[PDB]
Design an enzyme around this catalytic site. Structure first.
Site, PDB file in Angstrom:
ATOM      1  N   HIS A 182       2.136   8.572   5.103  1.00  0.00           N
ATOM      2  CA  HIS A 182       1.223   9.601   5.585  1.00  0.00           C
ATOM      3  C   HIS A 182       1.868  10.474   6.695  1.00  0.00           C
ATOM      4  CE1 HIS A 182      -2.402   8.836   3.374  1.00  0.00           C
ATOM      5  NE2 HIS A 182      -2.201   7.533   3.531  1.00  0.00           N
TER       6      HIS A 182
ATOM      7  N   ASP B  71     -21.396   7.400 -19.915  1.00  0.00           N
ATOM      8  CA  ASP B  71     -21.002   6.001 -19.559  1.00  0.00           C
ATOM      9  C   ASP B  71     -19.724   5.553 -20.258  1.00  0.00           C
ATOM     10  OD1 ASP B  71     -22.020   5.588 -22.208  1.00  0.00           O
ATOM     11  OD2 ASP B  71     -23.365   3.981 -21.520  1.00  0.00           O
TER      12      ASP B  71
ATOM     13  N   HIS C 264      -2.390  10.917  -0.797  1.00  0.00           N
ATOM     14  CA  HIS C 264      -2.528  10.470  -2.196  1.00  0.00           C
ATOM     15  C   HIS C 264      -4.029  10.585  -2.486  1.00  0.00           C
ATOM     16  CE1 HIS C 264      -4.109   6.762  -0.467  1.00  0.00           C
ATOM     17  NE2 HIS C 264      -3.190   6.965   0.464  1.00  0.00           N
TER      18      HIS C 264
ATOM     19  N   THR D  64      -6.843   3.951  -1.692  1.00  0.00           N
ATOM     20  CA  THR D  64      -6.522   2.515  -1.418  1.00  0.00           C
ATOM     21  C   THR D  64      -7.579   1.505  -1.893  1.00  0.00           C
ATOM     22  OG1 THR D  64      -5.112   3.224   0.290  1.00  0.00           O
ATOM     23  CG2 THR D  64      -5.817   1.057   0.482  1.00  0.00           C
TER      24      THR D  64
ATOM     25  N   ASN E 212     -12.694   5.721  -0.641  1.00  0.00           N
ATOM     26  CA  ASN E 212     -12.595   5.125   0.677  1.00  0.00           C
ATOM     27  C   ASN E 212     -13.810   5.459   1.574  1.00  0.00           C
ATOM     28  OD1 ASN E 212     -10.070   3.969   0.137  1.00  0.00           O
ATOM     29  ND2 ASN E 212      -8.948   5.600   1.205  1.00  0.00           N
TER      30      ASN E 212
ATOM     31  N   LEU F  48     -19.300   5.190 -23.357  1.00  0.00           N
ATOM     32  CA  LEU F  48     -19.677   4.385 -24.532  1.00  0.00           C
ATOM     33  C   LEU F  48     -20.481   5.218 -25.543  1.00  0.00           C
ATOM     34  CD1 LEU F  48     -20.948   1.275 -22.496  1.00  0.00           C
ATOM     35  CD2 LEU F  48     -18.668   1.647 -23.529  1.00  0.00           C
TER      36      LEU F  48
ATOM     37  N   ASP G 287     -21.533  11.393 -25.895  1.00  0.00           N
ATOM     38  CA  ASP G 287     -21.698  10.572 -24.680  1.00  0.00           C
ATOM     39  C   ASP G 287     -22.525  11.336 -23.621  1.00  0.00           C
ATOM     40  OD1 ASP G 287     -21.465   8.471 -22.881  1.00  0.00           O
ATOM     41  OD2 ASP G 287     -19.486   9.090 -22.146  1.00  0.00           O
TER      42      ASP G 287
ATOM     43  N   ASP H 278       0.883  -1.169   0.000  1.00  0.00           N
ATOM     44  CA  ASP H 278       0.000   0.000   0.000  1.00  0.00           C
ATOM     45  C   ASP H 278       0.927   1.226   0.000  1.00  0.00           C
ATOM     46  OD1 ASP H 278      -2.043   1.758   0.450  1.00  0.00           O
ATOM     47  OD2 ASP H 278      -2.239   1.408   2.544  1.00  0.00           O
TER      48      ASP H 278
END
Ligand SMILES: *[C@@H]1O[C@H](CO)[C@@H](O[C@@H]2O[C@H](CO)[C@@H](O[C@@H]3O[C@H](CO[C@H]4O[C@H](CO)[C@@H](O)[C@H](O[C@H]5O[C@H](CO)[C@@H](O)[C@H](O)[C@@H]5O[C@H]5O[C@H](CO)[C@@H](O)[C@H](O)[C@@H]5O)[C@@H]4O)[C@@H](O)[C@H](O[C@H]4O[C@H](CO)[C@@H](O)[C@H](O)[C@@H]4O[C@H]4O[C@H](CO)[C@@H](O)[C@H](O)[C@@H]4O)[C@@H]3O)[C@H](O)[C@H]2NC(C)=O)[C@H](O)[C@H]1NC(C)=O
Ligand SMILES: CNC(=O)C[C@H](NC(=O)COc1c(CN(C)Cc2nc(C)cs2)cccc1OC)c1cccc(C(F)(F)F)c1
Ligand SMILES: [Ca+2]
Ligand code: NA
Ligand code: NA
Ligand SMILES: [Zn+2]
Length: 806
Positions: free
Chosen positions: A265, A687, A420, A159, A180, A689, A683, A121
């Site tokens: 950190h 999405d 980060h 993370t 997170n 696509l 688009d 990590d």
């Protein structure tokens, strides 16, 4: 409730997890507060530490010890990892010379080389060079195996989104772990790092590698470790599983480390305190490799050493506060830090308006260290919008900064020196990839690639069919000695029409005019040849793009460019042209400023019209092949065909005209010619696509002319720039972009200045892979080259990032 009165005897780190109320003895029982009463005693032994010493050699087994040095330990599978070194005169793995692993050398019983993932990590890419002196095991994996100089994480560079992307091959917007911290408004539930909601499977979408394996009959070790289990116990558990009988033994394993992130950190990415965490992770790799060597598996197993994201210098003082911008700060909820996400504090607030929030956050302070976006306007390379857990308003935070709601949040809610989460092209966010083993190449460096690609290869390594994912399978074949995946090109779905001259000028009533009746057997033959495709080799260098959906379109040839013109969307899907290093830029002549010319090969009913642009007071038009780069005065007329016109807001035309008039020639000069393919993208539902016709939300006023959400260009030249783009014998080089088609330049705070001071900066931010454009257009590029298909797939995943060197 948990009946912790059950026992872990003969069950320590059992693979099959049990359901409540029965007590557990697996990797995660601590995180659930559910381990049996005797789990610490039986499963977390520590007596006498983790290393054999000379006096322990040949000891009488004491079942209490953390690991063993008795003569029976190899047959029991539970020796300390240095047992053979201390007790039997063997060398540490790190001390042995690298020798090529040409074939697996596996013990009998092994059906396939096992895959061992070693995940770290916060391991920033540049630690591999900067820390190499203190990481000899890692350095041997890197130098002797296959390594990239860095691996690109996904956005946000947090993370949980990155570890889950590693496991699934999906963007966070698709797997659902989009931060997170998250709020899902359908569940009305909140996901946090701390607490029990995060264990509910409803948050975790896609199909992670351990479930793909188990579904296809390949046994997996569990990939999660409760934080209190020491790393030495994690390694011994993996080595113990590897000694299970054949029918019980897993084929894929993972170790996870919370370091170097935890210390990063506290200390920043290069704080002097960071050396010891790196040495300790190295020592853990050494345990693993020594343990593999003991099991005679060190030339059988494939090992992947991989990180989730890197680490930047960030301190409490570099925080922007929304309370310095917003009148109404208590009416919003902000998810803060190295990205911001904003939603209404109360859904009963009819005073809430995201438009006034965006405007109050836009270019308000000269050195402002974040930029607001509605999520659909974020760079498409981020692939960060198509999920209900991603708030409509997004703040992209400059590297080294935080955003917070109010100051009291920063001292009542400096400590830290590293963080980060920033834009995944940021150099400090890049992380690491090394593969070592029989299926990887020997002493091989591979260029940087995206972490979304690994799931396919891990599937390749285990003989598994991958679940649908966002990798491009085959794009990483150059990492591998064997087990490559040999894809076929997709079949073209729609074949083009090749119209000739079918309409007289007077059949058109488009409200366009052109001063072109100013315009010879010799040279009329020549123009006829151009319209039939005689210069097409010069301008379509890699074949025509294949259209992978059902539609009606025409190929249109010209002296200077070729296009595929959609009769459905009334404009090209693509326009392809080559500009040599020697090409000259010219002006749009005075008498042609407002020239638009009917195309006598295309019906009036399948054409745009000028009156619609006259009438729509918001919308103007530009051209896909630029009139500035015409090969001659006479060829320039072609560039004003109604079939080369596309709808453009005036603010966007500032960008587009500078790209076409200035930057294309600059790239041709720099790259030794360029081939350019440009076109629109639709688009509207963000999405990633291609939209169908019934998803289009905006048209030029009063017409059926759909308005693009974006315009792309793919700019290709010879990797060996001693050869011109149009006579290139070997590998290609590409850069591309997907520019948002917006009615203002609010994104560019400096846009009142000359285009030379802001346009290329905008384009850089909106850099793209060719593959991103493929998804957004339903087109397949590079169909006819001299190159292997896997090499072309790697080319299609390339991202030109414009960062300085790692
Ligand atoms: C990156 O790779 C991924 C993986 O390949 C690509 O994502 C796929 O894209 C497809 C199209 O967007 C999509 O296919 C749809 O699947 C529908 C069934 O989906 C469920 O089943 C699958 C298989 O197990 C499962 O994976 C899905 O998981 C999603 O949803 C759950 C619950 O929310 C999440 O936990 C999970 O994270 C994932 O969410 C993501 O995708 C969904 C969309 O499925 C998004 O909403 C989320 O934001 C998130 O991004 C599901 O559990 C299927 O029903 C669809 O068919 C509809 O549309 C067609 C139109 O032709 C029609 O035939 C059908 O009738 C249907 O329309 C009807 O419903 C409409 C809406 O209610 C309605 O308007 C109509 O009137 C109709 O009634 C469709 O086939 C596929 O699910 C995802 N897969 C994943 C894992 O994300 C992704 O595109 C790639 N990205 C790029 C840029 O290339
Ligand atoms: C305090 N520790 C943490 O907060 C992180 C720690 N994570 C892990 O033990 C393993 O991490 C992950 C991997 C591991 N896998 C090995 C990474 C991969 N790399 C590749 C190349 C494929 S999969 C893959 C996918 C997601 C991961 O975590 C979200 C953790 C401990 C307890 C509970 C959880 C959870 F249940 F909430 F998720 C997470
Ligand atoms: Ca779309
Ligand atoms: Na107009
Ligand atoms: Na501006
Ligand atoms: Zn972190």
């Amino acid at each position: 409730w948990t009946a912790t009165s059950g026992s872990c005897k003969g069950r320590c780190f059992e693979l099959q997890e049990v359901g409540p109320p029965d007590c557990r003895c697996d990797n995660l029982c601590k995180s659930y507060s559910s381990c049996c009463h005797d789990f610490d005693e039986l499963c977390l032994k520590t007596a006498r530490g983790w290393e054999c010493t000379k006096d322990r050699c040949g000891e009488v087994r004491n079942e209490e010890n953390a690991c063993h040095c008795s003569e029976d330990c190899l047959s029991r599978g539970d020796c300390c990892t240095n047992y053979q070194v201390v007790c039997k005169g063997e060398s540490h793995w790190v001390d042995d010379d690298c020798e090529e692993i040409k074939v697996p050398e596996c013990p009998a019983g092994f059906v396939r080389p096992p895959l061992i993932i070693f995940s770290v990590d916060g391991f920033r890419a540049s630690y591999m060079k900067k820390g190499s002196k203190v990481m000899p095991n890692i350095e041997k994996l890197r130098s002797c195996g296959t390594h990239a100089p860095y691996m690109r994480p996904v956005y946000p560079t947090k993370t949980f989104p990155n570890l889950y992307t590693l496991a699934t091959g999906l963007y966070p917007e698709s797997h659902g772990i989009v931060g997170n911290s998250m709020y899902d408004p359908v569940f009305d539930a909140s996901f946090h790092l701390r607490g029990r909601e995060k264990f509910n499977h409803r948050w975790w979408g896609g199909q992670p590698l351990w479930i793909t394996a188990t579904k296809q009959g390949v046994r997996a070790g569990t990939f999660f470790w409760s934080v209190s289990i020491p790393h030495e116990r994690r390694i011994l558990t993996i080595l113990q599983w590897l000694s299970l009988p054949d029918n019980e033994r897993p084929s894929v394993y993972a170790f996870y480390s919370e370091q170097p992130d935890f210390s990063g950190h506290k200390y920043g990415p290069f704080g002097p305190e960071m050396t010891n965490p790196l040495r300790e992770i190295d020592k853990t790799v050494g345990q693993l490799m020594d343990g593999l060597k003991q099991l005679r598996l060190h030339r059988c197993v494939n090992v992947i050493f991989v990180g989730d994201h890197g680490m930047e210098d960030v301190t409490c003082d570099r925080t922007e506060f929304l309370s310095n911008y917003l009148t109404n700060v208590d009416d919003i909820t902000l998810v803060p830090g190295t990205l911001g996400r904003i939603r209404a504090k109360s859904i009963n607030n009819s005073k809430y308006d995201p438009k006034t929030i965006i405007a109050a956050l836009t270019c308000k302070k000269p050195d402002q260290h974040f930029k607001p976006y509605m999520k659909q306007h974020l760079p498409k390379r981020l692939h960060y919008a198509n999920n209900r857990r991603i708030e409509d308003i997004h703040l992209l935070v400059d590297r080294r900064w935080h955003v917070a709601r109010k100051p009291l949040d920063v001292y009542k809610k400096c400590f830290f020196q590293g963080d980060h989460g920033f834009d995944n092209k940021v150099n400090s966010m890049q992380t690491v990839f090394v593969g070592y083993g029989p299926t990887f190449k020997y002493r091989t460096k591979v260029p940087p690639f995206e972490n979304i690609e690994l799931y396919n290869v891990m599937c390749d390594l285990l003989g598994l069919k991958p679940a649908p994912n966002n990798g491009t399978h085959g794009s990483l074949n150059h990492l591998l000695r064997t087990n490559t995946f040999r894809p076929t090109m997709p079949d073209e779905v729609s074949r083009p029409n090749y119209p000739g001259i079918m309409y007289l000028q007077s059949e058109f009533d488009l409200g366009c005019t052109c001063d072109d009746k100013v315009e010879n057997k010799l040279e009329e033959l020549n123009k006829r040849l151009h319209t039939k495709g005689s210069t097409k080799e010069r301008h379509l260098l890699y074949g025509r793009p294949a259209v992978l959906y059902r539609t009606s379109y025409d190929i249109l040839y010209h002296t200077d460019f070729e296009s595929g013109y959609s009769e459905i969307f009334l404009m090209p899907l693509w326009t392809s042209y080559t500009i040599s290093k020697q090409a000259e830029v010219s002006s749009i002549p005075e008498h042609l400023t407002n020239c638009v010319r009917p195309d006598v090969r295309v019906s009036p009913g399948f054409s745009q019209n000028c009156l619609a642009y006259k009438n729509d007071k918001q919308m103007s038009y530009g051209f896909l092949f630029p009139p500035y780069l015409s090969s001659s005065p006479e060829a320039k007329y072609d560039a004003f065909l109604v079939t080369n016109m596309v709808p453009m807001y005036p603010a966007f035309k500032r960008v587009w005209a500078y790209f076409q008039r200035v930057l294309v020639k600059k790239y041709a000069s720099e790259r030794n010619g360029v081939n350019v393919i440009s076109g629109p993208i639709f688009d509207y539902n963000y999405d990633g696509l291609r939209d169908t016709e019934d998803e289009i939300k905006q048209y030029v006023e009063g017409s059926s002319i759909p308005v693009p959400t974006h315009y792309y260009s793919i700019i290709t030249s010879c990797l060996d720039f001693t050869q011109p783009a149009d006579k290139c014998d070997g590998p290609l080089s590409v850069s591309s972009f997907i520019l948002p088609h917006r009615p203002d330049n609010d994104e560019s705070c400096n846009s009142s200045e000359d285009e030379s001071k802001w346009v290329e900066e905008l384009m850089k931010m909106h850099t793209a892979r060719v593959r991103d454009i493929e998804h957004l257009t339903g087109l397949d590029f590079y169909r006819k080259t001299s190159r292997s298909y896997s090499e072309i797939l790697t080319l299609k995943t390339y991202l030109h990032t414009y960062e300085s060197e790692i």
